[PDB]
Write a protein that binds this ligand. Structure first.
Ligand SMILES: *[C@@H]1O[C@H](CO)[C@@H](O)[C@H](O)[C@H]1NC(C)=O
Ligand SMILES: *[C@@H]1O[C@H](CO)[C@@H](O)[C@H](O)[C@H]1NC(C)=O
Ligand SMILES: *[C@@H]1O[C@H](CO)[C@@H](O)[C@H](O)[C@H]1NC(C)=O
Ligand SMILES: *[C@@H]1O[C@H](CO)[C@@H](O)[C@H](O)[C@H]1NC(C)=O
Ligand SMILES: *[C@@H]1O[C@H](CO)[C@@H](O)[C@H](O)[C@H]1NC(C)=O
Ligand SMILES: *[C@@H]1O[C@H](CO)[C@@H](O)[C@H](O)[C@H]1NC(C)=O
Ligand SMILES: *[C@@H]1O[C@H](CO)[C@@H](O)[C@H](O)[C@H]1NC(C)=O
Ligand SMILES: *[C@@H]1O[C@H](CO)[C@H](O)[C@H](O)[C@H]1NC(C)=O
Ligand SMILES: *[C@@H]1O[C@H](CO)[C@H](O)[C@H](O)[C@H]1NC(C)=O
Ligand SMILES: [Ca+2]
Ligand SMILES: [Ca+2]
Ligand SMILES: [Ca+2]
Ligand SMILES: [Ca+2]
Ligand SMILES: [Ca+2]
Ligand SMILES: [Ca+2]
Ligand SMILES: [Ca+2]
Ligand SMILES: [Ca+2]
Ligand SMILES: [Ca+2]
Ligand SMILES: [Ca+2]
Ligand SMILES: [Ca+2]
Ligand SMILES: [Ca+2]
Ligand SMILES: [Ca+2]
Ligand SMILES: [Ca+2]
Ligand SMILES: [Ca+2]
Lengths: 499, 130
């Protein structure tokens, strides 16, 4: 649930309903469930990462970050869809960022690989057929459903540019079912040639992610982690290739190897709290809130002060309440000043999409040398720091110590202020030619815009060539609606109360 | 750009004659794109026959026993049934003579190879899962 930002589980008889993950879900796009090793996998598009947990939410680990091809050509930016294959020990996902891709990783985090990298712009849907080891995906911009073999070496089209904005896809027998946003419908067709096509139902809201429920869609295989979690202390995950298992530690633990053994050492920070079983480490405000958070009950002990504040608020010695974001932000928000106590802020750690300042404050990484004093100690824009800075995978650095997406290099806007992001003598080379399937070129300059940007009502390239000839641009035969401005919009947006 | 000019993806206008001159007049290489310069040039009508010198002959004139074409392949072996011969057309599976010279074919389900004499077997379960 994205409005509540939670994960919920229920029984198929509607008898019991439970919330499993309720914390640190910024923008969770898709969920996968593993029946062999009894695991839950999901994607987050604000932390730009992939997570694994147990079906009861008792432990969590992050298996992928940054870039999938070691060359930095593709990287987690908008990861939408996920599918699992246990017999091969692989996890497959898709991303619809500037550089769209489909990638596979091993269920223990190993063998990070890119499978599809061409003729792909908006891959919302990804699924696998276990009867013959085939991988299917759908693209909403190019309007297709394609299937390949699990390595990506052969490609075939079920539909070849006729589907307006699909979102999710599933397969059973000789049939494939998919959900469509722009016509708000669920459709079935034949998985090899798209023959025998019908609309099963249409809805008032957006249909979202579809599944087929039958035993054969979760095939039987032996669990390698079955006997006592394979001896693993915290997490047991299937190895890449599907044979054998790997022991691992939650995300605030350090993993180390010993003779025929593995060890997890808790390394969790101030403003966090550790449980006696070394199971998990939890935020400090959880420590005494009336809710048992450690499985052993180690946090919610009787030897605790009175809990004045609401559940999830942070409490000061005075018995006053502040939002946890207040804690260690270099300004006093609580009378006691416990909000900025040295004991709590020393050895403090920020979120994965943040950078830390000498005063133990966290700011988004894009603020880091934006020429603004975002940190009151001015530690972010220290000239020595902005000069020695090395930026994270998949973005590009400028002389003034500022970093921008790799895509922003070689176009028309001086994104770094200084024109170092656009070295003309490099940008005018054949290396920056527009993708002939998914991009449009503007006659006055060396800038590419996505094909959906053309005739959208905006001057996306500064010569306005992308909005000139729109009387000639047809709308998609079904799924689009046309405006007297010679614009095309999704038919879901007709009669929605917004201009 | 001018009417006389050609426009490049890098945003340069060049005199149109430059196109496909094989000079990289535009650093983007738009000026020398393969699909821009390629043409269906090797063609002659169904009424005609085509010869190695770049010349085409009416089918009645072919095999008149007289040079129509510099290479003489209109006459060189015209009317000979090469697939009745054995040393030539040393071919794997099936040989079909044509009015001059020969051509070769593989058995159904097999594939024919670039030497135009060898036969191969398709891996159907990768070539066409359908
Ligand atoms: C509705 O779902 C239930 C399981 O929750 C299933 O048993 C039932 O067959 C479904 N309805 C129909 C018409 O199949
Ligand atoms: C990485 O990208 C560069 C520039 O496009 C290319 O030359 C190189 O072959 C790529 N791959 C590797 C493995 O370096
Ligand atoms: C839904 O499908 C039915 C049957 O084809 C059709 O009669 C109806 O008009 C459709 N409704 C919408 C809103 O598309
Ligand atoms: C790892 O991936 C490569 C392809 O990227 C594949 O050739 C290799 O067999 C894989 N190995 C394992 C152990 O999964
Ligand atoms: C909370 O802060 C106020 C600041 O004016 C202070 O007066 C008060 O003592 C604090 N609360 C308690 C219960 O002491
Ligand atoms: C894009 O260019 C490639 C050659 O690089 C070609 O095979 C393909 O057909 C082109 N696609 C379109 C949509 O023009
Ligand atoms: C060659 O062609 C004939 C045509 O009748 C066919 O019977 C034969 O099987 C083919 N292959 C061989 C090896 O002769
Ligand atoms: C296209 O045809 C012309 C003549 O009509 C030239 O022969 C040109 O060389 C051809 N292009 C290519 C790439 O062979
Ligand atoms: C070339 O010749 C064939 C017949 O031999 C067809 O007429 C074909 O249409 C010709 N090619 C072109 C480009 O017209
Ligand atoms: Ca993102
Ligand atoms: Ca793109
Ligand atoms: Ca608690
Ligand atoms: Ca504070
Ligand atoms: Ca700022
Ligand atoms: Ca700053
Ligand atoms: Ca920009
Ligand atoms: Ca730029
Ligand atoms: Ca536009
Ligand atoms: Ca809207
Ligand atoms: Ca509207
Ligand atoms: Ca040229
Ligand atoms: Ca020239
Ligand atoms: Ca002759
Ligand atoms: Ca002959």
């Amino acid at each position: 649930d994205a409005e509540k930002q939670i994960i919920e589980r229920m029984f198929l008889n509607k008898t019991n309903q439970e919330t499993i993950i309720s914390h640190r879900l910024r923008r969770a796009e898709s969920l996968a469930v593993d029946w062999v090793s009894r695991k839950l996998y999901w994607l987050d598009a604000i932390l730009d990462c992939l997570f694994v947990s147990d079906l009861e939410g008792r432990q969590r680990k992050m298996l992928a970050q940054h870039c999938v091809d070691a060359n930095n050509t593709f990287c987690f930016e908008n990861p939408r869809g996920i599918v699992l294959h246990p017999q091969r020990g692989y996890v497959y996902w898709a991303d619809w960022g500037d550089h769209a891709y489909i990638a596979r990783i091993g269920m223990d985090g190993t063998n990070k690989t890119v499978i599809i990298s061409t003729k792909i712009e908006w891959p919302n849907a990804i699924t696998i057929d276990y009867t013959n080891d085939l991988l299917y995906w759908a693209d909403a911009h190019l309007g297709y459903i394609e299937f390949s073999d699990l390595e990506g070496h052969h490609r075939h089209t079920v539909y070849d540019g006729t589907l307006p904005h699909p979102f999710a896809l599933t397969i059973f027998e000789d049939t494939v079912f998919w959900t469509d946003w722009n016509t708000r419908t669920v459709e079935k067709g034949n998985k090899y040639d798209g023959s025998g096509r019908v609309v099963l139902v249409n809805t008032t809201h957006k249909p979202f992610d579809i599944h087929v429920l039958h035993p054969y869609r979760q095939p039987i295989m032996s669990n390698p982690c079955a006997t006592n979690n394979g001896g693993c202390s915290h997490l047991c995950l299937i190895k890449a290739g599907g044979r054998g298992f790997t022991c691992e530690c939650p995300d605030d633990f350090q993993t180390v190897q010993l003779r025929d053994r593995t060890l997890c050492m808790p390394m969790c920070s101030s403003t966090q709290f550790l449980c006696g079983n070394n199971e998990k480490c939890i935020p400090i405000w959880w420590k005494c809130d009336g809710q048992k958070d450690c499985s052993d009950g180690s946090d919610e002990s009787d030897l605790c002060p009175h809990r004045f504040c609401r559940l999830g608020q942070f409490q000061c010695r005075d018995g006053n309440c502040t939002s946890p974001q207040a804690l260690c932000n270099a300004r006093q928000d609580c009378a006691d000043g416990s909000d900025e106590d040295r004991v709590l802020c020393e050895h403090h750690r920020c979120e994965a999409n943040e950078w830390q300042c000498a005063n133990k404050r966290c700011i988004p990484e894009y603020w880091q040398c934006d020429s603004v004093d975002d940190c009151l100690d001015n530690s972010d824009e220290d000239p020595s720091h902005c000069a020695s800075r090395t930026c994270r995978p998949g973005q590009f650095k400028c002389n003034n110590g500022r970093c921008i997406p790799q895509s922003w290099k070689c176009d028309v806007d001086n994104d770094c202020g200084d024109y170092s992001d656009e070295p003309i003598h490099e940008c005018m080379t054949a290396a920056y030619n527009c993708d002939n399937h998914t991009e449009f070129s503007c006659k006055t300059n060396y800038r590419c815009i996505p094909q959906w940007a053309v005739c959208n009502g905006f001057d996306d390239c500064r010569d306005n060539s992308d909005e000139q000839g729109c009387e000639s641009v047809p709308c998609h035969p079904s799924g689009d609606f046309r405006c007297g401005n010679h614009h095309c919009i999704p038919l879901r947006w007709k009669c929605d109360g917004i201009d | 750009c001018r009417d006389d000019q050609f426009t490049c993806q890098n945003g340069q206008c060049i005199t149109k004659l430059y196109v496909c001159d094989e000079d990289n007049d535009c650093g983007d290489g738009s000026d020398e794109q393969e699909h821009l310069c390629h043409t269906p040039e090797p063609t002659c009508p169904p009424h005609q026959f085509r010869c190695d010198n770049g010349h085409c002959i009416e089918m009645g004139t072919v095999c008149n026993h007289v040079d129509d074409c510099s290479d003489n392949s209109d006459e060189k072996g015209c009317g000979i049934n090469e697939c009745q011969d054995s040393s030539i057309s040393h071919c794997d599976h099936n040989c079909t003579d044509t009015i001059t010279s020969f051509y070769c074919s593989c058995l159904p389900g097999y594939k024919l190879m670039s030497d135009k004499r060898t036969c191969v077997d398709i891996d159907e379960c990768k070539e066409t899962p359908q």
